[PDB]
Amino acid sequence: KPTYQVIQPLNGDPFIGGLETPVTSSPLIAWYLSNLPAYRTAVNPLLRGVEVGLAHGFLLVGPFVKAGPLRNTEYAGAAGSLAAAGLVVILSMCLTMYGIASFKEGEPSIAPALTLTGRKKQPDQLQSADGWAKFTGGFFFGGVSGVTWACFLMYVLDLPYYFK
Amino acid sequence: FGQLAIIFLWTSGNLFHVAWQGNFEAWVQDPFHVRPIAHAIWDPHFGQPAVEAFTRGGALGPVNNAYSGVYQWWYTIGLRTNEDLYTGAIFLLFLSAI
Amino acid sequence: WDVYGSDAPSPYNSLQSKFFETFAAPFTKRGLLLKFLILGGGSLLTYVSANAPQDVLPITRGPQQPPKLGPRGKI
């Protein structure tokens, strides 16, 4: 309420050059960057990014039709999610060849204790191998369905984004 | 050696390659036009005018116009019978593994 | 008294720890089992979209318009 943290940067020592402004941390609803996997410190893969997958798949129903090859055509208005699954499955590899900037082999995880856990030092290396890779079970499971759920249903549009 | 290998699988193929592809066992009937015939081009981007594309020489497919000379360097040594090819292939394999 | 916030922004997400999760799932994942669905992954469409006629092409047949493979000469 009384002005705010303006000039004097990034929280702490006026010399740690990430940066503070709005579109860092703000009333107008930074809130975003904090319920999709974004910030928080959060919890437990799958139900973080099976959301990405879920969302991320159908997001491509676009440049998979009027863009590219056949606009509107035979075989046909299978548009929405063609090989659009097909031309995931590497997006569904890629980050399953990432597994090198995450390593451990198991996921406790999950609560937290008292005490605390997500212990007072997160920004960085909590996540693991058999510690991240089940987010990968999400996005892919989520990808498909993220694709496929846009197919079976609908295709002479409707009021879906109006805003929002 | 090593590469001596592939130089040898450079051609056991492209020998093998032709008589499939191209039309020598054919081209025997008359020897001079031509659009000397390379490989067979599996290019899943080419617009139906693949006809209007490369339905060329003996084709039936958008084939490359061979220029490697060779097609004479092989006519010279001996053969015009590609059923008596199939073999230089198998030979530059008889040299490849060997 | 507490000027709030977020800070602690909105309910810790839905009673949804279940079904997606676990269930199905291609999962466990990497190292071993990854290839396990990127082997089909890349020999799937491929393989089976390195055929299926007869057919589906861009389309054209029977070389004529003043014959062709001739003239005329013969069959």
Binding site: - | W42, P44 | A50, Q54
Partner: peptide, 30 residues
């Protein structure tokens, strides 16, 4: 039965190198 050899090209371009840039991704993490 018959029609192909496409079998090869979706490899030699599509998965094969998909596996080159895959396993020597590497050379590093070979």
């Amino acid at each position: 039965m018959i029609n192909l050899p496409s079998l090869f090209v979706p490899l030699v371009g599509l998965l094969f190198p998909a596996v080159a840039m895959a396993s020597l991704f590497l050379h590093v993490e070979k």
